[model samples]
Target: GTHRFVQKVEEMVQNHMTYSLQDVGGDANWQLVVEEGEMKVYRREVEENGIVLDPLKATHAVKGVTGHEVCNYFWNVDVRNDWETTIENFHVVETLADNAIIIYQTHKRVWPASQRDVLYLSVIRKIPPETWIVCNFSVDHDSAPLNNRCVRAKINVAMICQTLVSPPEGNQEISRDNILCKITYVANVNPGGWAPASVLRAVAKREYPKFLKRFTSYVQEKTAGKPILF
Candidate 1:
């Protein structure tokens, strides 16, 4: 029912907001890797039981889009495979609401790491007229069985895209050209087994920036002629 799904999405949004605003911060173990473009990517080394895991956090400011447009691009399963280079296959397993869905995806193999598949629930919510947040967390369900050709992976990812609309100079309507969306993307994914920390970090360093760049560009291009989502 919509009631249960709405509750679940609310809880997820609360958890994500806390993590994005509080849990993520500079630490002694965090190392800044790239700051070349508008995007700044950071990685932290988390050691648990003698194994190191790489959790990445990145922030970028996209100048030509709004939070609504960005979330729409990310939440749409139909167009994901087109813009997401790493995705080998993508499908919607179920739809909980207009803004909530379960998805099954297979990501192309990065060298040395086996091809991986993910089953996750994604929820998008609007805080008000200008702010939007999209959250995704790994899930397991009987309806979406594991794919034999890909390794079933586990991922915990949260992204908050907040639109900062420039104030109008003289009663001008808020439009896309004057909007800037600040995106915070944080993810910690375990490939369901042992993978070298070095390789994992390298893959993340390469992939995360590429993912954001492509996503922002895709939204810009796709909405160039269409009206602003907000």
Candidate 2:
């Protein structure tokens, strides 16, 4: 008898998918408001535990703060805990106007109104224990010499924004369309592998002290002789 050896092929089946619970007990809500000409974004997030361990209730709101000049001018207002962690879903819808505005609010109460103008700030977010987030603010006006044109303004703002980077050579002018006073803030949370949010907050905190020193020094060096009001 001739016996033929036959190898059998192994058939493997793999199944993978995700599904939403049709009866999820909790709900999530989000809202946002934008104004015609502002540069602030307001956001709030509230999370509450529900009866079911897997389900939780979440409410969020994004407020327009274009007209909220009082808060904006104050600079470095802390609203960390009140806002949600994720910014992917965050968006802004603006009313038509000559300038752009993005407002943000949060349950994290800000500094008292009386002290709004003062520039006293602390970590907005505590990423890890002993680790905090901070930000710097600088207004680049094209009206001043060596910073009049849009290109100069962009360069000046860029320099202030990324102070860590090497200073560009001799006013490397870069033209930018539809530009205004550019704001630069760095984050210094971790060395690498962290997201922008973490980095932004960290850098903001780490650089805050330096921000004051550098900004004042720059102004003094540039306009030492000129009698001016800032």
Candidate 3:
């Protein structure tokens, strides 16, 4: 059973990559909520068998970083709390491989909503020269039981970071300063108990943009004088 699930990581990554390119729930209902700086956030409200859910998606671009650099920071659990503001606690529950992990995280309480915890499988893979992707999906693990202090939330989140390196002019070698990474993040999470849709959407609108801004700044600062990962 464990082997079967672990074997699907690559398949899951391909599926997520395809899903990130298409509009959420087709093209009709997605609305652009924020467009400022290098971030563009979108939301789509959906009703499935009488339950309403608002899914959030966004694309962000940052210069002077490569896909490998971005993904390295994203996949590292030790540095997560430094850039991820809402995370109160985080640790890898299992190490399936060097590039695959099962992580458990507790998010700081948002007023009117209980503190939440998530257990998900995260896998990072590279595509040829300069593309990297990180995929995460909630999974039930017997070894990592839910904590009573926090409600366990269900989530499906995927991110693709692709490095666009400018061609060398004349005989100069391609360098980090000429690279730009574009990150597309898609997340659909249901807090599990009955939190108001209005409240959930509002929180997502505020949080998603903040999340990308913080992450980009963190990478730029940390990689300032360091060699690029790619």
Candidate 4:
């Protein structure tokens, strides 16, 4: 899946954005290694709450964040064909605001146009201003070494590397690892992905100095008395 997604991203960058992989900053020459089993695939289901119009229901999604109390991530799933057989009995546990918990009950639908195409579940989240939120997707496990597949893969690092090289901050180091996973057991599930490059570059070219100043102000709030050089 990562391989297919990476291929799509490469294609998107070359076609729609009119930028060769080489044109962007960072080490474009870096080879991406897709190591299998270095990362764990966890299945998340949405649980039911007896309420009307839960956004998660209509959207079939949920998300959570770590450290600070805010949702830096989100995801949505669709099971229209077999509602009674597939989703009615399912339970999806998601982190709601800060540290709260919630369940989402979803309805089933059968749309004819998407029968052949894979179910498109999208996870959308806000990238913090000036800060590049690095999401290192890996197949590594808990007991492995830092250098082990437990989380270290070139593609994973390359994603972070790409984000660092092109963003509102343009800084080489990112501080958070708010990572979330969306797994589909069946074949041919297309989960929409994200790349910070295009948007980051646009922000860089158009709002460079202004964003730089804004970023400086942002760091000050977090650092408190610590001295940071812009």
Candidate 5:
């Protein structure tokens, strides 16, 4: 029953939010690799089991949008293909709740690296004081077992966002120009079998940054004329 999983999902969401927004300002382990526009991506040069499973934290500031707007797009998988360029195939394994779901998707095969796929529980939440989050943590389900068709991977990812409103309210018409979304995206992936550390790091070093910009840009464009979700 979903009743059993709902409690676990809530705990996972809370824990992820804490980790996603953790301060890395003075951490020497986190190296700044991408500093383009309003986004700053950081990663730890750590490896696990010969795989370069370095956790990624990207903090971005997007104008003309709110936190709810950003998390809304990130949580909804219907428009995911519009932003995720590497997705080769995708599906929702199960809908656990209105804001919680199980998803499975495979990405385009990378040379010298085996094709990879992921299955995780994705959820969106609203925190007080204008904070929002979308958690996507790896989970195992009897119905969705490992497939021989592609390599199975575990990905713990979350998008945490808070709205920034300048001038401190009191305005009758709060336009998009007055709103900004502070987004923090965190992910730790275990590429289920084996791949060269060099290959893994190199691919993630370049692709991760591109992925963030591409996704946020897609959101900005699509919501250009739409009503604000917040």
Candidate 6:
């Protein structure tokens, strides 16, 4: 059956994709928290309920894969565990379509913090000319009641990618070398309970950079010998 949440998901995804364009929220000073090659990750620390809600914006450019391909593999549910190491347990609460659905997952425990679980919707929007976007945000449902076992975390994340192709004129011999992909990923996660800000900040500072740095190569390994997709 077609899910009832599609329209609302569209509005939220549109809002997030627009929101992802900012260098940082309002006038808050964003610190460069992680850097590797052309990839740079920034975080602006803000405290709430004595918990750190550091919003991050990271950017990168990679060649050999199209932006669509990068986003395609990322939004693909089949290979998430092969790369997204944080999910200790996973479930799909809703299967709306190829573009939008709801997921529930428990994250690997971090020291001194309660184990975390989340229920969220992930949507993929592919615009014309090969600009791809994926948006994720928290959701609540009666069936998945918040229990005492794990802290229910909330997250708002958006990933935007655009493919730039410069195929040589020898009639069409493009593989990985003839294309470029620009990436922009933004995230804000509420750890759901009190944890030392130092430890919380430390967690993000390392996790994100590794996600982007190794992501391309891992995806490359999957598609290196296959035909390009957009």
* After superposition, candidate 1 runs with Cα above 4 Å error: 1-8, 22-29, 47-52, 171-173
lDDT of each: 0.77, 0.21, 0.80, 0.23, 0.82, 0.82
What alpha-carbon RMSD in Å does predicted model 5 have with respect to the real structure? 2.0
Residue pairs in steric clash, candidate 6? none
**What's the residue-level lDDT of 74 in candidate 3?**
84
lDDT score for candidate 5 against the true structure: 0.82
Q: Which scores greater on lDDT, model 2 or model 4?
A: 4
lDDT of 5 at 229: 76
**CA shift at 118, candidate 2, in angstroms?**
25
Question: Across residues 27-107, which tens digit of lDDT does each residue of candidate 2 receive?
Answer: 223222221232211122322231111111111111211111111222222332122332112112221122222222121
TM-scores of all candidate predictions against the true structure: 0.87, 0.18, 0.90, 0.17, 0.92, 0.92
The top-ranked prediction according to TM-score is 5
lDDT of 6: 0.82
Error (Å) of candidate 1 at residue 228 is 2.2
Q: Order the candidates by lDDT, highest first — what do you get?
A: 5, 6, 3, 1, 4, 2
Candidate 6 per-residue C-alpha lDDT over 112-188 given as tens digits, one digit per residue, 9 for 90 to 100: 67799999888888866457888888988766889899999999888889888877887768777887788889899
lDDT by residue (1-230, candidate 5, tens digit) is 25557787778777876666886757787988788998888998877667668899989989888788888888888888778877899888888878888888888975366788888888888877378998888888887888888898899888999888863457466677877888888889888877777888778878888889998897788778677778
Provide C-alpha RMSD values for all models, in order. Answer: 2.5, 25.0, 2.5, 19.8, 2.0, 2.2
Assess candidate 1 and give its TM-score to the true structure: 0.87
